Structure formats: C-alpha cells, structure tokens
C-alpha cells in the first residue's frame, strides 16, 4: 500500500516536495497521510481479532 497513490500527484515523497514547496505540496501530502493512516489502522484491527 506504500506504492499506491491515493489521489495525489505521486505516491513517493521527495517527489512532491521536489516539484512543490508550499501549500500546493500540503494539499497533496494530506491526501497521502489520510490514505496511509487508514491502511495502518486496518492492519492493527485485523491483528487484534
């Protein structure tokens, strides 16, 4: 799920920070942060069960 985009321009950091420097990068990073936070929470719950 790390090699998976979530609607952002790119799925790898340092390639949004390289081509953007300000709020434009913040809007893309928030899409990745949300997507990676869900797949991590889903993993933990399935481990508890």
């Amino acid at each position: 799920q790390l090699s998976s985009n979530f609607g952002a321009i790119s799925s790898v950091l340092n390639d949004i920070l390289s081509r953007l420097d300000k709020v434009e990068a913040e809007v893309q990073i928030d899409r990745l942060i949300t997507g990676r936070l869900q797949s991590l929470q889903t993993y933990v719950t399935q481990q508890l069960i």
Binding site: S3, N14, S18, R19, L20
Partner: protein
Amino acid sequence: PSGDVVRFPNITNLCPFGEVFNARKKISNCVADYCYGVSATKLNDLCFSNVYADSFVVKGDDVRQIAPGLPDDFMGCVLAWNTRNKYRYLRHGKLRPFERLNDYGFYTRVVVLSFELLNAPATVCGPKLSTDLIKNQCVNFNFNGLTGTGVLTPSSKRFQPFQQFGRDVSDFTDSVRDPKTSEILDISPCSFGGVSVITPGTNASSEVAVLYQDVN
C-alpha cells in the same frame, strides 16, 4: 545524516533558453538558468531529458483555449506575452494530443514547454556544484533526481546498458547508476529502531538502563 553528496552530468554549456523565446524545437545538453505538475521556483534543482518548446503565433483572444479540459496526464510550463503598440474551425473529427480555415487578421507568443524526466541519462538542468563520493556513512543523496538519505556501498547487480535506476521486489530504490557509470547500492537508511527504558520503579532508585532494539 553525516554529509552531503551530489552527482550531476559533467556536461557544461550555455543554453538557448533565451534565444527561442524572442525571435517545435528541442533543447538538450545545455544548462538552463531560468505550471501543471511542477513549481516554477523549484525548476532549477531537477534534471530532465530533451525539454521541448512549442511555438506559434496567436493573439490574446485564443490564449484561454490551451489547457486540459495538451494531454491530461502530462505537465509543462506556459508563458505568454502580447505586443500591439491562421486557424481551423472546420475539420471532420478532432486530433489526439500533440499532433498536427480562415485568418485572424492581426491589426494594431504562447510557449508550451514539456519536461521529460528519469527516462534517459540526464542532460538538461541548471547549476549544481558537484561533490565527491562518500561510502559507508549515513549521508544525503542529490543524484540526478533522487533526493534521499542512506548508506552507500559498491554493488554487484548486472545492470543492462539502457538502465540507470534500480528497484526491489516492492518498488523501492535499492540501487543506482552514478552519472559516471558505476553501480552503487544505497541499502537502508543507515539505522533506526525503538528505545525501551528498564527501571526498578523510582521507589528504590533513580538508575535506569536503556535498550536499543535492532542495531549491530
């Protein structure tokens, strides 16, 4: 990290970036000085291949027609400028992107730059003072288009002549080809882990031991 490492193509030249604007053309093996996928102020730190410029004459009445909605998955930079001090409106079917009756009648240009990156050996990008190679120490990377951090070491991977990067079984960059044709693998970001503190409880002493989880 411990140091900064940079590696750029040794080619040096003065670029026609200025001549073309004031007068489709290719630009390669130059050093330009100086948006739909890149920031203008961030353009002078990335290295592309064969930047192309599309040039044509149209008055400001048609500048608002050149934009997606030009491919939809492609990027580029657009400049325009007017000074006043042909076209087709009949054709059976439209055209695919990047392919090629009346007169406007001017009485008293639009440059669509295209960037190609990380495909062929880097040949077009701005000033960047190079640096020597350091190995076996957590350092910073500034290869052609790979800014990161890790530890470098000689590699034993048989690159094909037409390849310049490396990939793992999970699509991570665990190898690279130096712009001087050397295969050095950047394995791991040196070291990281967790920290745990062992204490007798603060009701008998204030002495603690620390465990570092996964380290040599």
